[PDB]
C-alpha cells in the first residue's frame, strides 16, 4: 500500500537572493521524507512549485525535482527588502500518489550591502567598577555600500550593565558595575543596514557580527562578603 505522504523537515523555510540574480542562482534546499517502506515508489519523493495562492513567486522561482534546491527560474529584477512566499509541494511515486506542501520565505537582498565590522574582536581598555552611567567603554565600526549602519547589542548583556548608541556604535555604561559580582563580559554586537532595519528585519552573517571583551577594573568599594 501507499498510505503515508511526504513530510517536510520544516513547515516554513527561509532563504536569500540578490535583487538582480542571474537564472539558476541557488537560494536554499528544502527537504521531505516518506514513511512508507524504503527503496520503493511509495516513498520516492519528487519536489515541485505551486501557483494557487502565490503565482508570481512561482513565475520567478523553481525547485529542482530530485535535489530540492530552490533557484531562480529567470534573471531577476526585483526590489530589495521584499519577501516572497514560494509554495513547494513534495509528492511520492505511489499509488495513489500522496503529497504535502510547505513555504519558502525568500528575502530579496544583496550580500555586499550587509555590513562588515572593522574587527571581529574589540578589546577596549578596562572600565572602573565605580564608573558613572554614560561613561564611554569602547566603540565599534562597520561599513556597507550605499548604507548607513544601525548598531545593536544582541547577546551577553543580560545584566543591562551596558548600552550602545545605535548610530555612533559607541558602547557605554548603563547600570553601575561591581567588580566583585563580575569581572568581565563579552558582548555580541550586530551592525544592520538602515534600509534593513526600516523593513523590520535583521540579517546576521559572519561579517556583520563581532565580539566585545569588556574588563572590569576593581576599586575599593564595599565587597560582598556572604550571600544567602
Ligand atoms: Ca508515500
Ligand atoms: Ca562595586
Ligand atoms: Ca571593589
Author numbering: 898 to 1125
Question: Which sentences from the paper describe this structure?
Answer:
The tip of each stereocilium is linked to its tallest neighbor by a ‘tip link' filament essential for hair-cell mechanotransduction. Immature tip links are likely formed by homotetrameric protocadherin-15 (PCDH15) proteins, while mature tip links are made of cadherin-23 (CDH23) and PCDH15 heterotetramers. CDH23 and PCDH15 are unusual members of the family that feature 27 and 11 EC repeats, respectively. Here we present the X-ray crystal structures of repeats EC8–10 and EC9–10 refined at 2.8 and 3.35 Å resolution, respectively, which show an EC9–10 calcium-free linker that alters the linear arrangement of PCDH15's EC repeats.
To understand the role of non-canonical tip-link EC repeats, the human protocadherin-15 EC8–10 (PCDH15 EC8–10) and the mouse EC9–10 (mmPcdh15 EC9–10) fragments were refolded from inclusion bodies produced in Escherichia coli and used for crystallization and structural determination. The structure for mouse Pcdh15 EC9–10 (3.35 Å) contained 228 residues starting from Met 898 to Glu 1,125 (in the most complete protomer of the four found in the asymmetric unit). A structure of mouse Pcdh15 EC9–10 (without EC8), crystalized in a different condition and space group, shows the same unique features. This suggests that the EC9–10 interface is robust and that the observed features are not a crystallographic artifact (Supplementary Discussion). Sequence analysis indicates the absence of canonical calcium-binding motifs in the PCDH15 EC9–10 linker across different species. Consistently, the PCDH15 EC9–10 region shows a calcium-free linker that is bent (∼90°) and breaks the linear arrangement of EC repeats. In addition, the PCDH15 EC9–10 linker has structural features not observed in DNcad, Tcad or any other cadherin structures. A unique EC9–10 310 helix is located in the middle of the EC9–10 linker (His 1,007–Ile 1,011; blue arrow in Fig. 1d,e), and an atypical EC10 FG-α loop (Leu 1,091–Asn 1,105) form an EC9–10 interface that stabilizes the observed bent conformation of the linker. In addition, EC9 and EC10 have unusual and unique structural features involved in bending, namely an EC9–10 310 helix and an EC10 FG-α loop that form part of an interface that keeps EC9 stuck to EC10. Also, unbending was not observed and the end-to-end angle and distance were stable throughout both simulations. This suggests that the EC9–10 repeats are bent in solution, spontaneously and occasionally transitioning between two very similar bent states. Overall, the data presented here strongly suggest that the bent, calcium-free linker in PCDH15 EC9–10 plays a relevant mechanical role in hair-cell transduction.
